[PDB]
């Protein structure tokens, strides 16, 4: 799951624009989406269609639990992959 972090760690710097996530966060997110039962692999981040239930899910967890670390990474990592498919 190294190629799934390089494609985002390099793309976010072009999409997010001085607002990319943290290297330690990316690894703490791609692994969460799996256990959460959202995706089966980190490369699934390139699947524009399941972000709906995934985005609303992480947004609800931050509230129920109270934290917002993982969700923060999703909101950013998604801000890039979203503009990717476009252009």
Curated annotation (Swiss-Prot):
It is found in: Virion. It comes from the Viruses. This is Matrix protein p19. It comes from Rous sarcoma virus subgroup C (strain Prague) (RSV-Pr-C).
């Amino acid at each position: 799951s190294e190629a799934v972090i390089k494609v985002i760690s390099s793309a976010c710097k072009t999409y997010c624009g001085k607002t990319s996530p943290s290297k330690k966060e990316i690894g703490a997110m791609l692994s969460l989406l799996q256990k959460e039962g959202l995706l089966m692999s980190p490369s699934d981040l390139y699947s524009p269609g399941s972000w709906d239930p995934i985005t609303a899910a992480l947004s609800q967890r931050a509230m129920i639990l109270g934290k917002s670390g993982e969700l923060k990474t999703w909101g950013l990592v998604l801000g890039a992959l979203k503009a990717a498919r476009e252009e």
